[PDB]
Structures are given as structure tokens and as C-alpha cells.
Paper text:
We selected the cis‐COM domain between modules 4 and 5 of the BacC subunit including its upstream E and downstream C domains (termed E‐COM‐C). Recombinant selenomethionine‐substituted E‐COM‐C was purified by Ni‐NTA and size‐exclusion chromatography, crystalized and its structure determined by SAD phasing at ∼3.3 Å resolution. In the E‐COM‐C structure, the cis‐COM domain appears as a small globular domain sandwiched between and partially overlapping with the E and C domains. Both the E and C domains adopt their canonical V‐shaped structures. However, the cis‐COM domain is well defined and makes extensive interactions with both E and C domains that result in the formation of rigid interfaces. The cis‐COM domain shows the helix‐hand arrangement with a helix‐up conformation, in agreement with the revised upside‐down helix‐hand model. The helix packs with three hydrophobic residues (L5076, I5079 and Y5083), which are conserved across COM domains, against the palm of the hand motif, for example, the mostly hydrophobic central residues of three β‐strands (I5091, V5160, S5148). Here, a seam segment (aa5056‐5061) follows the last helix of the E domain as a mostly extended polypeptide chain, which then turns to fold into a lid region (aa5062‐5072) that closes off the COM domain structure between the N‐terminal end of the central helix and the first β‐strand of the palm region. Together, seam, lid and helix represent what was initially defined as the COMD domain in trans‐COM domains, and all these segments make extensive contacts with the E domain, including salt bridges between E5060 and K4934/R5056 as well as between D5065 and K4937 and an interaction between D5074 and R4931. In the E‐COM‐C structure, the E and C domains are oriented such that the PCP binding sites on both domains face each other (donor position on the C domain).
Numbering used by the authors: 4618 to 4978, 4988 to 5287, 5307 to 5349, 5355 to 5386, 5396 to 5437, 5454 to 5461, 5469 to 5488, 5494 to 5513
Amino acid sequence: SYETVEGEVLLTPIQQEYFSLNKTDRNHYNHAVMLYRKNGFDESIVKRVFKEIIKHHDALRTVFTEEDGKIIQYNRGPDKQLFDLFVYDVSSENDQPQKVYQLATELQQSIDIETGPLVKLALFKTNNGDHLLIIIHHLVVDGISWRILFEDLAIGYSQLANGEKVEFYPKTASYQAYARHIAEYAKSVKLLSEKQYWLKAIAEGVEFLDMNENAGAFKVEDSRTFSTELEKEETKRLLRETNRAYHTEINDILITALLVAARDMNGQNQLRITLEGHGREQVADGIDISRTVGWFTSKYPVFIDLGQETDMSRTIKMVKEHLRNVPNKGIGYGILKYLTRDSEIAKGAASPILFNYLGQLSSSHLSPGEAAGKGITREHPLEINAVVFRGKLAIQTTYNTRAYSEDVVRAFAQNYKEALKAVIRHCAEREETEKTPSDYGDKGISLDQLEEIKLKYKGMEIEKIYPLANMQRGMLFHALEDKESQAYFEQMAINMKGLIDERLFAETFNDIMERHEILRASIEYEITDEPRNVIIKDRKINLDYHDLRKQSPAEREQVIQAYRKADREKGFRLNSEPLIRAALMRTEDDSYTFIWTNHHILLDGWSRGIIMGELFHMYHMKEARQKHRLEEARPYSDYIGWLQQQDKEAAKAYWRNYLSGKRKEAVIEFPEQLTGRITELASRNNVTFHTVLQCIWGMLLARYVVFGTVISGRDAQVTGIEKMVGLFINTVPTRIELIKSVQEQALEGRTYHDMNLSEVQSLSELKRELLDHILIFEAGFVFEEIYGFNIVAVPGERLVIKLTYDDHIIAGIKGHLQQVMEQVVQ
């Protein structure tokens, strides 16, 4: 999909930063590489490869022109001057390194942004090989872009030398499209939600080293660079046996050493630095730039304040956590500063130091010259670059002479090396690996809060921690609001007939626990700010097995009913105790009684049936010595993560406008023809059977309006929802060709069927008086099964409606039901 772009392109924030800092001597600031080929460079081939390279990476042709102080960036067409190629013969000089350097430096300052092409070349010829110089202005290339250029040139040169036409890989999204993409993202509400974060990162300035106030503008001519290194032994410890202490990365240790060094000399536990990101991860789902050539570097500040904490074991954790809390990898700050132009953002203090860790690591031996001008202004007095060349960490320290003296910077570099060694030895000698809140998936937990959760659940390994779903949160809030501690219990008794191996049933039961993590979850609401699901790794639940075969069935039933009464009396204390309890008692040889109790938070009735079915399937596979066949279970955390993904402020808007205004049972069976007739009416109107029956109930309510309907809550766009275990059941209110009109009412709420009823009625005038009732629509061993106003309807050949009320009025309810479901059909 090769294309070509031409015309105005918006300035990316990195480009806008370049023009703001550099107002004079902006002509030459380049990215230069020297290459050596033993057999020599064919002048015909190199000028043809670069001709195709430039028109394939359209950023290289762009031009920056000025109009009364404003900068307009234009992308030139392929027909204009693409590059300048110069060829030199330094074979006979006998002082080639001197001659090539002076030639390369002169050509490196010849770039005119307004007129000249931004790519210029210099081929040097020697009797012992040829050298090619590639100079590209930094406004159209970065570190990753040159890696792309090298691959295309290597493929292009090899294939062109073999006679074939040059054809590169298909072009990705243009830099012009990328610039317009981030500019559109500049006014998105998602980015503007990060203003308070970046305000904190720039609110205060760090004194750091003693700086000369009269340094003026920091420049390249006033900047010196020296490097310090760690020996191989200590560098080996950092790479291998350091990250294991707290599950950190190499960048965490180096940044921590920066704070430790500043802590020892400045006395403050606060440090502000600027970090460089490659800026190639898409901010919003859309344009990708995997192969696009351009300047995608994104700079953002990070301000770390540890208060009074000096225990460096704690320091490493909270420094790692602070780096884990940067939103969108820091791309937001650059967009917010230059594309949104927030005045508060533009007034932040300058970061005293710029830090960047490149990572781990034919080429020519001749220098390419100075790639930057002496008049180029640099916004950071200090720059630190850390690289491991062979096996040793080389710390390249760049400082401005006018800002800091040489001895001061070398002193800072030396004790930063000492501070780094202090951090390395602390992690190397660490015995046990300490997990961090970001490692558990929830970075909203403080270090102390995690320790209390660990302390509360001591003796148990925590697997994952994530917040409760809004369905679970509503359940817990009225669970603490004691409703006699009876509405939160789901207790059933299921007897089964057959010969059961006790260990296999327990093992099959435990395999269910591992399969569904929510059953192993314990609710935490006191330690954390919000209720949070704490999942224990090896949390088992004991299936207490008592035989009691040798007694009368009436005597057995007395013990069975006593246990059902006794365990219901116990309740759920939520004191770090499992919320699932099951008992297996053996009435006789092939007749058991299995009772199951659970808290409403963990699962619903739909999930309850799934567990029983999976338990039935897996156990029989155990008997046959054949592995079970079953779909992979999707974690309940994925649904919660999706739930937190989409915003529900519009969901609140949806419901607020919608709302503007002794146990007895009875069974009603209708003729099969009557049930069949209304089903035909639903099909002809393209209206669901749920919708048509809602209208028939709604019209009656007008004579006595909005009523409550129970929904599975399993329509979310998460894979495997229908077969995953969790709390998805919900009751939602519905307000009432009429069947067609409310048919689209159901689909409008389909997107917003995820919030609890208690918060929906808060948007209503009647509040708790909104709903008076609910409407419900429905060799081994074998199974067998044994509000105060709810209505249940069961479809089938004959319509059956079961109504429970906690007397002749009931007859009147039935009589009017059948009389009104007759006139409309005819």
C-alpha cells in the first residue's frame, strides 16, 4: 500500500519544542552515521537507493518556512530536490582522518531548512575501502527511524546490486497522519483528565546541585561531557541478581540511584527529572507508526517526593510505583503542553536533569563531525545516559559549564555511582522476593495497605488483587447494612445417587476452585479505600465429609436438617474467611446429600449452575482416567477490567431521563393454543417474547408506570461471559405497536445494564418507592434437586406463571389477566 503525501503537516510537540528552545542557529542539528564497505560503494547504486528511500519516507522531503515569526511545515513532492550527494577521494591524502573530519563537519553545517533538502550525503573513497556519510536533519528522523532506514537500505542495496528493481516494505501511516492524529487527541477528554497529574509533576522545583543563576541560556559550546563506569562484577549483579528483589526493571534501579544521590547531598527526598520515551505507542486506538520515519521522541517530567521515608527497601518500591503510575507512558505531557497549550502546564519549573537509559548493545572508524551547533540551546543543565557496552555500565554525564562547575558535576557523578552501588547491593543480598502493588494488577494500593492485606491474610500467598465490580459493590454496601444477615446467603441442598469416590469428589471440587478464581476471592473493604477482591493463590475450601450411614433415614434427615440450620446460623463473618462452604454427607451406600452455601458477592444463580455442571463433567472424567474436555475459563477480572474501561457517566444520563414521574403461591396455566397464538404475534412483529409480556403487565400497572425486571447481566462484549463464574445478575426498572416501542427501550438499556438498582433509583424522584415488585423470566452418579413479592413466568407449550406473596385479591389478579390478553390479539 505505497502512497505519497504532500502539503501542510502539523508540528508535533517535539518539533514545537525544538523551535521554542532554538531561535537562532537552528539550521544544522542533525543525525549523522558513518558506514564502511571494504569492497567500496558504487556511486550509481547509492544515488538510486537514496532516491527511492526519500520518496518512500516522505518526511525527509519536508520544509520549514517562517511567516512573520510563525512556522509553517510543508512536505515537498518527489519531483523536487531530494538530496545532495558529494563524492571525495581521500586515498592519497595519507592524513585521511583529518581530511574526512573537516569535510564532514563542513557538509554537516550546509543544511538549509527553508530551501535545501534535509538529507545530504558524502561518499569518501580510499584505497582500503569506501566510506559513506549520511546526514539527516533531526526534525525528520529519530533513533528508531534510522533503524528502519538501515534495513531498507541494506535490502535495497543488496537487491539493486543484483540487478533487480528496489522495492521496500509497504508504507505505514504517514507522519502527516500521525501529527493530525495526536492533534485530534489533544482535545479528547481522556488527555485533559491528566492535567492534575502533570500539574503535580511540575508544581515545584528541585534545587539539586548548586547552580549559577547567571548561566543564562545553556548551549552546546558551554557543555562538556565526561563518562563514569561500573566495573564488570558490580554491573553483572545489576543485570542478573538485582531485579529479583522487588520485581523491578533496570530503569527503576538507575532512577532510584538518582534520588539516593540527591538525598545524600541535598537532604531532600524529592527529585524531579525529565525522561525520554520513544513515543511510538498509539495514544488512542488508531494510527500505527511501526515503520513510519520521523521524529517521534516524547519528553515528560516526573516528580518524586518520598516525604520522610528513608528505608531504601521502601524507597525502591515507591520509586518503582511512581514510575508505574505515569499515564500513557508520558506522551500526554508533550501533547498537553504544545498542542493543548494549557497555561498552567507552560509555567512549570525546569527539570535540572534529563535522564535516559538506552539499554544493551559495517561501522566506520572515521568521525562524522559535530551534529549540533554551538548556538543550539539545551533546556537541561545536566544529562545522564546509561549504557552497557560490553559488560560494564557506562554513565555518560553531560553538563553545562556555565551552570555547574566541573568538580561539582564529577562529585555528583561519583556519589551517584556510589548510590547506585548501594542500591545494587541491597537488592543482590535480598533473600526473598517482595512483590509490589503494580505486580498484583492494582496500583491504587499503597505499600502500607498491601502489607496490611498481607498481614491480614498471613500464611497465604495472594494471587491477584482488583476492585469489586459495581454489582458486587452494591451487594457489599447493603451487606454491611445488616438486613438480618439472611438475604446474602445462597444455600441449596442437592442429593445425589451413585457410588462416589470421596477423594475424587474432593479433588474435583478443588479443581473447580482453581478453575474459577472468584471462588477463591476474599473481600477487603477496611484496609483499602474502595472494596477490593483479594484472590488467594492456593485457597482451598474444606469439603467436610461425615459418613453417618448407620442410622435411620429419619435420623439422617434430622442431622441433615440440623446442619442446614446450623451453618445458616453461622453466617459469613468476612474475617479473611472463605465465602464458599460445602458439605458432603453419605446417607447410605449410593445416596449422598450435598449442600452448598455461598455469599452473593462471588457468584449468581447462573454461575451456580455452571459450577455444578462442570463438577459433574470433570468427576466422570476422573473415573474414566480420561482428561476432561471443557472450554478455557475466562477470569472474572477481565469482565471487571472491561467494566472499568467504558465510562458510565452517560449511563447515569440514560437512567435519569428515563425516570421522570405470610408466603402464598398461585399457578396459572393457559391453553396451549393461547400460548402459541401470542408467540406467533411476537414473531410477526419482530418483537421478543420478553417484550410483549412486559407490555401486558405494564398496562395493568397503569390501572392500579415502571416495574422491575431481572436480567442475567451477561450481554457485555467480553469473551466467554456466558460460561464464566461471577456476580452478573441484576434487576433493572423498565417504564411503560406499543410492544415495538418498548422493544427499542430494552436495547437502549442493553449498553447500560451494568449498574446496580440502588444507584439507578437515586436518579429517580420516588427513590425507594419506585419499585413495589419484580418480574422474573426463565458407574458414576446422577443429580436430583430438592423480596416479599416476586413474579415468575415460564414459557413453553402452555404458559405457566408462578406468583409469590409474603386472599381473594389473588383470584381477581388472575381473572383480569386472561380477560385482557384476548382483545388485543384479535
